[PDB]
Amino acid sequence: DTLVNNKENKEFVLKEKSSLTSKINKELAHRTALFNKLADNISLLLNKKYDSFEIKDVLEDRYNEMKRDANPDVYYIYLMDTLDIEKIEDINLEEVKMSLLASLKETMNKIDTIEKKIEEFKNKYISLYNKVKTTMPELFDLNEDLVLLYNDFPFDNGMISSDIFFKYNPSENIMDHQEMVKKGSITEDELRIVNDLEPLDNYRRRKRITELRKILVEKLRILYLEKNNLFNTQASCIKSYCYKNPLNLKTLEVLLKKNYYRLKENKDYDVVSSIIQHLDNVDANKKKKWLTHERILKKLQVLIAEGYKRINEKEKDIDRRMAVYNALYEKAQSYNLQKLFNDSNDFLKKYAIMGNS
């Protein structure tokens, strides 16, 4: 079935979109309330060793990491280990374990019912979208839609996971500024491969230059790719572990890139405040209260610092490969082989401006 741009049909779709959105949001609130109520329980079980927010944050992140699996077994040993419950010298361990397992069972059973309600609303929302995606595409924004993007999550992202600050403690400080702006450099030994062209005749020079050019361009293609992918992963992690509300990841990616280069140019630039401001301004009502505990700030600080560190490592690797490439090109020019690099110079331009326009 399909609906034309006729006004009868368009007002139906906007009304139905709004209603399903409001129904899904009420279910999400009910889910959050159940996680909060459980976390309040567990805080008291642990004699307030961790506060309720910290426990809720772990539970919710683990729930998303586990594809919203409602099996209590996915949470029980994970919380025992993550919160080091057995090592708490303050409590009667065995009654705590019993209450915890029972509380996980009752709560996860209720969240299961809620998540299955959300799934049914999601099915109707997608079927509504499929009726208008060709005839009135503008009624839906695929870069941010809460429901169309509901299952996306940065699994296996390498930067953050639900047990952060419990089981490992990454730095919240961005890398040393002098290190971050210093260009990657190569040694004389790394240029041996280029200077080794000098004893060769013209035919083997051209062969070897062609072979090395191909190898360097392939390496650089991968590096630019990976650098862009890191910004994308950083943005997805900020959305899913910190903000926990719908947003346009493309917009956030652009800002993370801008801020990286801003920091290189100005060591006093405040990247964290810039990202906080952005996330505060996403919701038109400014009704999204998301930075409500220091743990959220710390996760954000880690993600900014770990992503930028990785991105900087790639940039220095790009500098080093380009240094060999430029040395090879300069040699080729001296052998009247400048034209061997016209096409690769073009590729490298194309790879370099992906994601930067």
Side-chain angles (χ1 to χ4, degrees), residues 283-299:
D283 165 89
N285 324 93
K286 330 247 199 203
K287 251 43 138 180
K288 274 335 199 313
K289 212 38 46 203
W290 64 278
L291 178 60
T292 56
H293 188 280
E294 198 184 346
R295 174 172 177 79
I296 297 301
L297 172 65
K298 296 178 58 171
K299 291 162 109 188

Side-chain angles (χ1 to χ4, degrees), residues 119-314:
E119 190 85 6
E120 196 24 75
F121 290 141
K122 184 175 146 74
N123 294 343
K124 312 156 154 333
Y125 191 102
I126 284 153
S127 159
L128 184 67
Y129 170 66
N130 281 341
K131 282 161 184 151
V132 316
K133 61 182 181 62
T134 76
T135 52
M136 317 183 264
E138 73 272 338
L139 307 178
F140 291 83
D141 187 334
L142 266 82
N143 288 123
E144 69 165 48
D145 191 287
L146 161 84
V147 185
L148 301 182
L149 305 180
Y150 186 83
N151 291 340
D152 297 350
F153 187 81
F155 297 103
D156 298 315
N157 58 72
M159 297 174 177
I160 188 168
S161 65
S162 50
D163 55 343
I164 186 161
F165 307 127
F166 289 97
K167 296 311 263 193
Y168 61 102
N169 291 274
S171 179
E172 316 158 341
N173 298 325
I174 295 172
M175 73 173 293
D176 175 63
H177 191 265
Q178 264 172 247
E179 202 29 47
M180 160 207 210
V181 301
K182 167 186 35 182
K183 278 226 113 164
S185 66
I186 63 179
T187 83
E188 286 146 7
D189 259 316
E190 311 177 59
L191 285 211
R192 193 217 263 101
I193 283 320
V194 174
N195 299 306
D196 279 351
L197 295 162
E198 187 73 25
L200 300 184
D201 49 292
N202 286 338
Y203 306 104
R204 285 183 296 154
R205 277 178 181 171
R206 172 194 290 270
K207 183 166 191 283
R208 284 233 200 131
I209 287 164
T210 300
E211 284 166 358
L212 188 43
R213 188 201 66 212
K214 289 177 181 163
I215 290 168
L216 287 170
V217 168
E218 256 302 295
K219 285 176 180 186
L220 278 156
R221 180 188 64 80
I222 303 290
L223 287 164
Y224 280 114
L225 195 46
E226 287 181 321
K227 182 182 152 205
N228 204 62
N229 287 349
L230 286 166
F231 276 113
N232 284 354
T233 295
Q234 184 179 46
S236 187
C237 289
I238 287 171
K239 172 171 174 184
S240 289
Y241 282 86
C242 293
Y243 183 56
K244 297 193 185 196
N245 285 291
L247 57 69
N248 184 320
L249 280 169
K250 305 311 144 205
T251 302
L252 179 59
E253 283 152 28
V254 170
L255 177 60
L256 287 160
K257 291 176 182 172
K258 286 191 182 305
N259 279 351
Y260 176 80
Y261 297 110
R262 287 173 178 147
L263 181 54
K264 289 180 60 142
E265 161 289 341
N266 173 16
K267 77 186 159 238
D268 297 318
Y269 186 74
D270 188 351
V271 172
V272 167
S273 287
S274 170
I275 300 298
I276 289 171
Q277 190 173 236
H278 178 82
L279 298 176
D280 287 340
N281 290 330
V282 162
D283 165 89
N285 324 93
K286 330 247 199 203
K287 251 43 138 180
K288 274 335 199 313
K289 212 38 46 203
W290 64 278
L291 178 60
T292 56
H293 188 280
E294 198 184 346
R295 174 172 177 79
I296 297 301
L297 172 65
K298 296 178 58 171
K299 291 162 109 188
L300 178 62
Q301 286 169 317
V302 166
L303 285 170
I304 286 163
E306 178 64 27
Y308 281 7
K309 183 191 316 153
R310 300 188 191 198
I311 285 152
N312 197 254
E313 290 184 305
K314 295 287 173 211

Side-chain angles (χ1 to χ4, degrees), residues 55-73:
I55 297 157
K56 179 249 200 213
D57 201 43
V58 171
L59 275 158
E60 185 161 60
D61 289 346
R62 171 75 172 182
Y63 181 77
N64 286 321
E65 287 167 347
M66 300 295 291
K67 295 206 100 93
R68 301 192 304 269
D69 187 351
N71 177 9
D73 291 355

